[PDB]
Amino acid sequence: MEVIELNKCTSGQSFEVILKPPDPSLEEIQKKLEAAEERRKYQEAELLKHLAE
């Protein structure tokens, strides 16, 4: 059990102890945010069309 890389300062200390060794673009985001508003606006169109009937 070996205590390595010990560092001390006035606020505390730190050390390591070893027991044993061994993203889409702006385009693509604004794209799919709009494809879902187009599905959302269609659904509201289909609703108004049905209420006209």
């Binding site: 509201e44 609703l47 108004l48 209420l51």
Partner: protein, 424 residues
Amino acid sequence: MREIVHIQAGQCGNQIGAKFWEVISDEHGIDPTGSYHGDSDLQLERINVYYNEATGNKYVPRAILVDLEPGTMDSVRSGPFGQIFRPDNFVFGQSGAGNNWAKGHYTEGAELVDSVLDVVRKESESCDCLQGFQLTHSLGGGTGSGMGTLLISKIREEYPDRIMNTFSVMPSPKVSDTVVEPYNATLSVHQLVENTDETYCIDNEALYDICFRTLKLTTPTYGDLNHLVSATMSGVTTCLRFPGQLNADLRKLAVNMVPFPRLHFFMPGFAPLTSQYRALTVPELTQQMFDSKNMMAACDPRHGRYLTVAAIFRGRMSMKEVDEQMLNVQNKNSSYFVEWIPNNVKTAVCDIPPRGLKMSATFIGNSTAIQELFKRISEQFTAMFRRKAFLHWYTGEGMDEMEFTEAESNMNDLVSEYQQYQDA
């Protein structure tokens, strides 16, 4: 998400609608002139939900009052709280609907609907954040049923993105105005399956039975039935009306209670059933609000399973004891909830009790057992419609048989859809 617009349509609509404004006005400490005289600040923190603030520091219900005949609406003005309502918000015809859905929806009602919408629009315009509408009506007559559903259709066209909530009184031969009640109710349910987010099923059969059997009133009056209705309406609106830690609204009510868009018909419950001196214990409240005898819809919840449940305890009690009692039924009667909606029961507690009572509970159940209510109206419908009996009252207003077949079919469909999820 703050302001609610309240619409009350027809005799039943305006009667239960009147009681509700008498009851909550008294809870929020508003007097028959619209002046605050309460004590608690809790009574005003969310007053905006149901009231507009006017000149002189007056509170005006966001209430619109509709009827095709002048009678019942002169009775509301005459009645105990009649002076609180904005007078421009009374809208009424002359000829009445005579228990005729077709007249409510298609002839007499058509002429009047536009001028109600204008009052609705006026209330919607001066709303900081409208959550949507609550309508009081019966399904059994002409105006509440036929014109109420016409209004719902037209409010949805103009406000597709606001929430539509109904207190819908189902008819019963035990409280019968006319033989054509199953007709007007079947046509009205078709409208409600398509165009409401939430419907409180106030079954006149249930109110009667509670008054006869479990309250020893030999001759129940509309006054007696309405006492139970106004208690339920006070209950199910408590969290919309008072802070806090739930801070509920009509959309969150809808998202949490409705797993399938068509299955939004709620079995309301109340404990203790009154017409006391001993306050109930939390276990008593709990056992009673889950009991058949306490439901405002004549359905056996043991014939069904609960999809979702909302319970609101009022008074002073340990939330610990409420929690323990609410988990006790869930863990000892798991068969009568669906295993496939985890954590489907939600409990809320408000410190302000209703007038008279020390502690009360209100139950709201989305139970598949509501099918029994629709099947019952279907059977009363089929027994007449198979001999085309009393149709001429509807054909004489321009309706076809076809539209009756369609409403029959859509209600049998709704019953199958409830059946589907009882065996799943």
